[PDB]
Enzyme design. Structure first.
Site, mmCIF file in Angstrom:
data_model
loop_
_atom_site.group_PDB
_atom_site.id
_atom_site.type_symbol
_atom_site.label_atom_id
_atom_site.label_comp_id
_atom_site.label_asym_id
_atom_site.label_seq_id
_atom_site.Cartn_x
_atom_site.Cartn_y
_atom_site.Cartn_z
ATOM 1 N N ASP A 39 -7.198 -26.132 -33.957
ATOM 2 C CA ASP A 39 -6.634 -26.014 -35.457
ATOM 3 C C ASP A 39 -7.200 -24.466 -36.060
ATOM 4 O O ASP A 39 -7.463 -23.699 -35.463
ATOM 5 C CB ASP A 39 -6.715 -26.788 -36.434
ATOM 6 C CG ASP A 39 -5.631 -27.303 -37.235
ATOM 7 O OD1 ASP A 39 -5.668 -26.461 -38.388
ATOM 8 O OD2 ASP A 39 -4.845 -28.053 -37.343
ATOM 9 N N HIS A 69 -6.481 -26.347 -43.100
ATOM 10 C CA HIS A 69 -5.808 -27.142 -42.366
ATOM 11 C C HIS A 69 -6.468 -28.009 -41.520
ATOM 12 O O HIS A 69 -6.395 -29.346 -41.144
ATOM 13 C CB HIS A 69 -4.405 -26.465 -41.837
ATOM 14 C CG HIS A 69 -3.373 -27.299 -41.180
ATOM 15 N ND1 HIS A 69 -3.590 -27.521 -40.016
ATOM 16 C CD2 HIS A 69 -2.225 -27.765 -41.578
ATOM 17 C CE1 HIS A 69 -2.332 -28.211 -39.446
ATOM 18 N NE2 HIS A 69 -1.833 -28.447 -40.632
ATOM 19 N N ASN A 161 7.949 -30.184 -38.281
ATOM 20 C CA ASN A 161 8.394 -30.703 -39.570
ATOM 21 C C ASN A 161 9.735 -29.865 -39.987
ATOM 22 O O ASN A 161 10.251 -29.426 -40.866
ATOM 23 C CB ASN A 161 7.388 -30.149 -40.501
ATOM 24 C CG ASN A 161 6.011 -30.728 -40.318
ATOM 25 O OD1 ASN A 161 5.793 -31.928 -39.975
ATOM 26 N ND2 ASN A 161 5.018 -29.842 -40.465
ATOM 27 N N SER A 224 1.731 -32.751 -39.262
ATOM 28 C CA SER A 224 0.167 -32.398 -38.828
ATOM 29 C C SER A 224 -0.901 -33.531 -39.369
ATOM 30 O O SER A 224 -1.975 -33.537 -38.969
ATOM 31 C CB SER A 224 0.007 -31.248 -39.565
ATOM 32 O OG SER A 224 0.444 -30.019 -38.909
#
Ligand code: NA
Length: 279
Positions: A39, A69, A161, A224
């Site tokens: 990430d 994140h 998403n 996520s």
């Protein structure tokens, strides 16, 4: 062991009904397993990690998470308060920039890096990789994920998403890895979650509280967020010796809570990750 007033997602994964607030789990809590979080990086110093996290590689100038994140996902995997597998070792691979973006070639390299790197770490119980990222279909990306899985790492990826069919997304669309969809606290498919035959399992993904940079915490939503619950769960199960890397994804589908979710389009599995914990 039990964690009282836990975040809703942790309670959900150890329950057979929604609306509970306790996270019941075995005390082994993933000890002995390792989870790669691929990430934006992880703020390793966060008290929540209790020294179990470290950056192992960056494709940018700093090895750090300037975005948060990565830190959030990492916390869902294995932070003390917010994690599934509370005693798992975490390794950060920064393929994403501080804007939360990265080029496919760098994502690919980060994946290839993990399949090699794991060879020089002490992970007696198994190795997991959690990839909360994705873009437009790419057979190259797909092929990188397949290799990582093939190397002996349990790979979990976000479905995306877009409220669309995940077949159009990568690495989501790679069949050999575990593609994770999102759900909300009422057992509804999350409104943004992708769907489709490629999905393997759903996890909690709307309004997920976890660690954040600056030593803070915050609640955010996405596939996520669901990804790490599954990655964390796989580590947990591996530690328990219930399953292995090559067979975690199937095992989790085999033992999931079935048909409990609403708003599931025809052809998409109706399976919600579940730890089957029994005192
Ligand atoms: Na799959």
């Amino acid at each position: 062991a039990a964690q009282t007033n836990a975040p809703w997602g942790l309670a959900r994964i150890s329950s057979t009904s929604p609306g509970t607030s306790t996270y019941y789990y075995d005390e082994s809590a993933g000890q002995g397993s390792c989870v790669y979080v691929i990430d934006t990086g992880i703020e390793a110093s966060h008290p929540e990690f209790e020294g179990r996290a470290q950056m192992v590689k960056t494709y940018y100038y700093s090895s750090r998470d300037g975005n948060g994140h990565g830190t959030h996902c990492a916390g869902t995997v294995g932070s003390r308060t917010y994690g599934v597998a509370k005693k798992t070792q975490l390794f950060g691979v920064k393929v994403l920039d501080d804007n939360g973006s990265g080029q496919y070639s760098t994502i690919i390299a980060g994946m290839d890096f993990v399949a090699s790197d794991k060879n020089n770490r002490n992970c007696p119980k198994g190795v997991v990789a959690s990839l909360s990222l994705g873009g437009g279909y790419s057979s190259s990306v797909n092929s990188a994920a397949a290799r990582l899985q093939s190397s002996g790492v349990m790979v979990a990826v976000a479905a995306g998403n877009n409220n669309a069919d995940a077949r159009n997304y990568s690495p989501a669309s790679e069949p050999s890895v575990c593609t994770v969809g999102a759900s909300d606290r009422y057992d509804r498919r999350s409104s943004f979650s992708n769907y489709g035959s490629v999905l393997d399992i759903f996890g909690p993904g709307t309004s997920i509280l976890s660690t954040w940079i600056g030593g803070s915490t915050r609640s955010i939503s996405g596939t996520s967020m669901a990804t790490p619950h599954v990655a964390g769960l796989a580590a947990y199960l591996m530690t328990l010796g219930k399953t292995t890397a090559a067979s975690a994804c199937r095992y989790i589908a085999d033992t999931a809570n079935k048909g409990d979710l609403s708003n599931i389009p025809f052809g998409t599995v109706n399976l919600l990750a579940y730890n089957n914990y029994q005192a």
